[PDB]
């Protein structure tokens, strides 16, 4: 009855992994023009199916804020983005004394279109031509040490040199269905309720994650997934005022944004080869840039969130304030609709605060009433705070229209010792990590560890 040891190769067990995943691009964004598509050219296309498992009785511990995978995602985006823009459009020649004047002035929305004349190097380096480019607001900075004169400078001349964009490249989020390397596997929670951490029950295997479209945005997160059953409010520590609350909504809300003014485009050859693009002149009338949002659906949302939020903050009213203040990159919502960069002023979106009863009362109506936010567009931006990767946008002609189904929310919390009857929430954001963390959380990466041991009692004759 003596027990003897046997070895079992290939046993189904695992340990937490610390490795990397890879593209897994969608194999549909591939066409000849893929070389002109950002973050697709570089990637390998795949088409894998979902996995059946279901590991039965098996349960597992997940933790969204400890999943290192998000950093891999961040780091690659920074480096892929940066690499894709190297062989083109250095704009150093632009940083010359610039001369400019007012639109008409009058309406503030027209004043901003500064006609900006300057001398640029021609195909012959000896010859110089006087040319003008339409520019607006922030990129045009009063020249240092002048005295309210017509002399201006480009914003980046006191910083580092910037680029524009390779004009051929498309920047549109393509989902990447990240796949595991051999020896690794991905696990996912199919559980609702899940606070962002803890012992998920029915835990499916994953060969490749469901693809996630990278998005650059803050505050409201668009083109994302929905909660399956109910709004999910998730936070690393709800009692820590320094943390950001991530909210997954159950139903979609629709946002419609646009830029009304027909805009023409021109280009300037600077020295050899490379051309520069800029607005010729906004060719129509100049009207505001906005985002339509239905009021109904937004007032339904704020209370529904308040109801769920109330669970962690009981017997209190939920109030929504505006941002703390700062640069538009800090306080405004940011969109890249159509490839143009919009910064939209959140007030009065989150102006309201409903009594902690959150009664879901509304009614049928023929009303089409909306809440409209107004937007300010930029030409030069620090992409992901990449001042050292600063870039000038290419202009786009005609009028921009832009949908869609939103949103994930990024919120913070406030209120002092002088309240505690209500708490105040504010718009928050700026860390790209949370934008992806929001969806990446579903998955955990593990390593398969074959070769284990067990007694059997059976013995080898030899």
């Amino acid at each position: 009855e003596n027990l003897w040891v046997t070895v079992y190769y290939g046993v189904p067990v695992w340990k937490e992994a610390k490795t990397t995943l890879f593209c897994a691009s969608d194999a549909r964004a591939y066409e000849k023009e893929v070389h002109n598509v950002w973050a697709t050219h570089a990637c390998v296309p795949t088409d894998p199916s979902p996995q059946e498992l279901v590991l039965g009785n098996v349960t597992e511990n997940f933790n969204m804020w400890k999943n290192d995978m998000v950093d891999q995602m961040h780091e690659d985006i920074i480096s892929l983005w940066d690499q894709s823009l190297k062989p083109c459009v250095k704009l150093t020649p632009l940083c010359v004394t610039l001369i400019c004047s007012d639109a008409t002035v009058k309406t503030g929305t027209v004043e901003e279109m500064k006609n900006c004349s300057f001398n640029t190097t021609t195909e012959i380096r000896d010859k110089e031509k006087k040319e003008y480019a339409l520019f607006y607001k922030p990129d045009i900075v009063p020249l240092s040490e002048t005295n309210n004169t017509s002399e201006y400078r480009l914003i980046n001349c006191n910083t580092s040199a910037c680029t524009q964009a390779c004009p051929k490249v498309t920047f549109e989020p393509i989902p990447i269905h990240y796949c595991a390397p051999a020896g690794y596997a991905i696990l996912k929670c199919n559980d609702e309720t899940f606070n962002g951490t803890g012992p998920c029950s029915n835990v499916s295997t994953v060969q490749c994650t469901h693809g996630i479209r990278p998005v650059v945005s803050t505050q409201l997160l668009l083109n994302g997934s929905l909660a399956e059953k109910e709004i999910v409010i998730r936070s690393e520590n709800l009692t820590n005022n320094a943390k950001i609350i991530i909210v997954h909504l159950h139903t979609p809300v629709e946002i419609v944004c646009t830029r009304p003014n027909n805009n023409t485009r021109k280009s300037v050859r600077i020295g050899p080869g490379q051309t520069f693009y800029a607005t010729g002149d906004i060719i129509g009338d100049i009207k505001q840039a906005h985002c339509n949002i239905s009021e109904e659906k937004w007032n339904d949302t704020l209370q529904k969130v308040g109801i769920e939020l109330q669970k962690h903050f009981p017997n209190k009213t939920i109030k929504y304030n505006q941002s703390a203040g700062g640069d538009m990159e800090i306080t405004t919502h940011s969109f890249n609709c159509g490839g143009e960069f919009f910064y939209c002023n959140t007030s009065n979106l989150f102006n309201g605060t409903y009594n902690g009863t959150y009664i879901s009362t509304n009614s049928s109506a023929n009303s089409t009433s909306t809440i409209t936010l107004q937007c300010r567009i930029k030409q030069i931006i620090n992409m992901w705070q990449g001042v050292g990767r600063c870039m000038y946008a290419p202009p786009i002609a005609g009028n921009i229209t832009c949908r869609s189904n939103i949103t994930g929310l990024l919120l913070t919390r406030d209120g002092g010792t002088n309240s505690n009857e209500t708490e105040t929430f504010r718009p928050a954001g700026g860390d790209m990590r949370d934008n992806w963390r929001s969806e990446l959380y579903k998955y955990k990466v593990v390593k398969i560890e074959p070769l284990g041991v067990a007694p059997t009692r059976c013995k080898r004759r030899v």
């Binding site: 003897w4 190769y9 046993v11 279901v54 098996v58 051999a182 398969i448 284990g452 030899v462």
Partner: protein, 132 residues
């Protein structure tokens, strides 16, 4: 449902099926662990490392015997300090995942013992080959 393809082409499917289940299936798991500008390095490293791990495991199996069967008896008895459970409990109720949380201790003890029983066998075989 599932079946072997999902369980072992995919991974860990039997983890919840208790270890006795494994006796009929631990095959495929092994074969699917050997599958296949700057990103070229990332990919090459991943490929190379998978190979190195695979081969290192094969080397250990070789050293201990038997070894091409994937399940081998190594003729080493169990230390009583490791015999706190019945075989039926181990094989019918426990999982590999579960066993592995506790039996995780004394890993190198086992490996040492396995290597040595094989070393002795080999000498005994050479002596018999010499006599024969």
């Amino acid at each position: 449902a599932v079946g072997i393809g999902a369980v072992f082409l995919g991974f860990l499917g039997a983890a919840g099926s208790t270890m006795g289940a494994a006796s009929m299936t631990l095959t495929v798991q092994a074969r699917n662990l050997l599958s296949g500008t700057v990103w070229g390095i990332k990919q090459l490293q991943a490929r190379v490392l998978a190979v190195e791990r695979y081969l290192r495991d094969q080397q250990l199996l070789g050293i201990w015997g038997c070894s091409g069967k994937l399940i081998c008896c190594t003729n080493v008895p169990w230390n009583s300090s490791w015999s706190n459970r019945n075989l039926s409990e181990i094989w019918d109720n426990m999982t590999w995942l579960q066993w592995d949380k506790e039996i995780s201790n004394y890993t190198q003890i086992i490996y040492g013992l396995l290597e040595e029983s094989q070393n002795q066998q080999e000498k005994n075989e050479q002596d018999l080959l010499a006599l024969d």
